[PDB]
Design an enzyme around this catalytic site. Structure first.
Site, PDB file in Angstrom:
ATOM      1  N   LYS A  47     -19.446  10.958 -32.672  1.00  0.00           N
ATOM      2  CA  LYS A  47     -19.090  12.258 -32.285  1.00  0.00           C
ATOM      3  C   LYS A  47     -18.111  13.177 -32.898  1.00  0.00           C
ATOM      4  O   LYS A  47     -17.970  14.414 -32.787  1.00  0.00           O
ATOM      5  CB  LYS A  47     -18.802  12.115 -30.852  1.00  0.00           C
ATOM      6  N   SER A 104     -16.279  10.760 -23.927  1.00  0.00           N
ATOM      7  CA  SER A 104     -17.465  10.137 -24.770  1.00  0.00           C
ATOM      8  C   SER A 104     -18.822  10.505 -23.788  1.00  0.00           C
ATOM      9  O   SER A 104     -19.457   9.614 -23.543  1.00  0.00           O
ATOM     10  CB  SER A 104     -17.187   8.698 -24.716  1.00  0.00           C
ATOM     11  N   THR A 209     -13.502   6.536 -29.772  1.00  0.00           N
ATOM     12  CA  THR A 209     -13.919   5.182 -29.519  1.00  0.00           C
ATOM     13  C   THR A 209     -15.423   5.017 -29.619  1.00  0.00           C
ATOM     14  O   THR A 209     -16.101   5.969 -29.600  1.00  0.00           O
ATOM     15  CB  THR A 209     -13.510   4.368 -28.252  1.00  0.00           C
ATOM     16  N   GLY A 210     -15.945   3.653 -29.642  1.00  0.00           N
ATOM     17  CA  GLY A 210     -17.703   3.533 -29.840  1.00  0.00           C
ATOM     18  C   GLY A 210     -17.869   2.285 -29.040  1.00  0.00           C
ATOM     19  O   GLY A 210     -17.152   1.178 -29.305  1.00  0.00           O
ATOM     20  N   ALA A 211     -18.986   2.156 -28.444  1.00  0.00           N
ATOM     21  CA  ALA A 211     -19.708   1.091 -27.815  1.00  0.00           C
ATOM     22  C   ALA A 211     -21.131   1.167 -27.712  1.00  0.00           C
ATOM     23  O   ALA A 211     -21.645   2.264 -27.306  1.00  0.00           O
ATOM     24  CB  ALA A 211     -19.050   1.025 -26.379  1.00  0.00           C
TER      25      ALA A 211
END
Length: 262
Positions: A47, A104, A209-211
């Site tokens: 993003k 997010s 962040t990322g998940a």
């Protein structure tokens, strides 16, 4: 020093996953690399490049960030912390960008993708700033499949670190846009247990962040250690089991190891 590699190697072994780290110390341009050239599924960290593509546009088309898009109940996806409050109403590109970076929000990401014309465009932008590794292929939520061996929507630690340096400290963006991206990253509300957790409380940080599936747990950031030169850091982590749980703590530990004494 050489004991940094030993600690990282041991941290990965204990985690049971695959770790990716790239640290760039802007004080002398030195770097800390661990599987820095391997690809990882970016997930939500993608993003940042997406939001930056919109900011780039604003440099030419005045007031574009104030352009509106309507939110329809059929736009909602799996994660709509902000967008769900606007159903039947509108949101500016600035609000969407804010919603996708600091919370997010998945629906906000797809809205920006529609504005830009699709993920291929984000990939082109990446190329425009010298990034030949980054690639975006799908939208939310599919882009989080993180399937082992799949190159779709991936990038490498070292390449994402460089592009983040270029966007937040270099000349990839113009002054106003650069500042707006830095302010958005600094206002992220999801990074509490990641990179930040491995740093001294008073240091100033901006991150995303990322998940995703396979317990993929990521985070990218710029760190300002008191009055010293900024550090650009990327910690990517993924696991063997498709339904594995996220390991935000592994990114926190990696952060500490490489920034200790900086």
């Amino acid at each position: 020093v050489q004991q940094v590699q030993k600690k990282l190697a041991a941290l990965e072994k204990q985690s049971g996953g695959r770790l990716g780290v790239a640290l760039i110390n802007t004080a002398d341009n030195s770097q800390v690399l661990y599987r820095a050239d391997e690809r990882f599924a970016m997930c939500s960290t993608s993003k940042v490049m997406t939001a930056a593509a919109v900011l780039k546009q604003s440099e030419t088309h005045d007031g574009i960030l104030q352009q509106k898009m309507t939110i329809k109940k059929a736009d909602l996806t799996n994660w709509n912390p902000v967008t769900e409050k606007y159903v039947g109403n509108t949101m500016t590109l600035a609000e969407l960008s804010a919603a996708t970076l600091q919370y997010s929000d998945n629906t906000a990401m797809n809205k920006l993708l529609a504005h830009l014309g699709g993920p291929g465009n984000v990939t082109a932008f990446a190329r425009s700033i010298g990034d030949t590794t980054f690639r975006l292929d799908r939208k939310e939520p599919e882009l989080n499949t993180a399937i082992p061996g799949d190159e779709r929507d991936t990038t490498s630690p070292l390449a994402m670190a460089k592009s983040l340096r270029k966007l937040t400290l270099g000349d990839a963006l113009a002054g106003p846009q650069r500042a707006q991206l830095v302010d958005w990253l600094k206002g992220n509300t999801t990074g509490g247990q990641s990179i930040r957790a491995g740093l001294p409380a008073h240091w100033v940080v901006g991150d995303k962040t990322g998940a995703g599936d396979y317990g993929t747990t990521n985070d990218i950031a710029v760190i300002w250690p008191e009055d010293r030169a900024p550090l650009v850091l990327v910690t990517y982590f993924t696991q063997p089991q498709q339904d594995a749980k996220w390991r935000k703590d592994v990114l926190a530990a990696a952060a500490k190891i490489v920034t200790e004494g900086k």
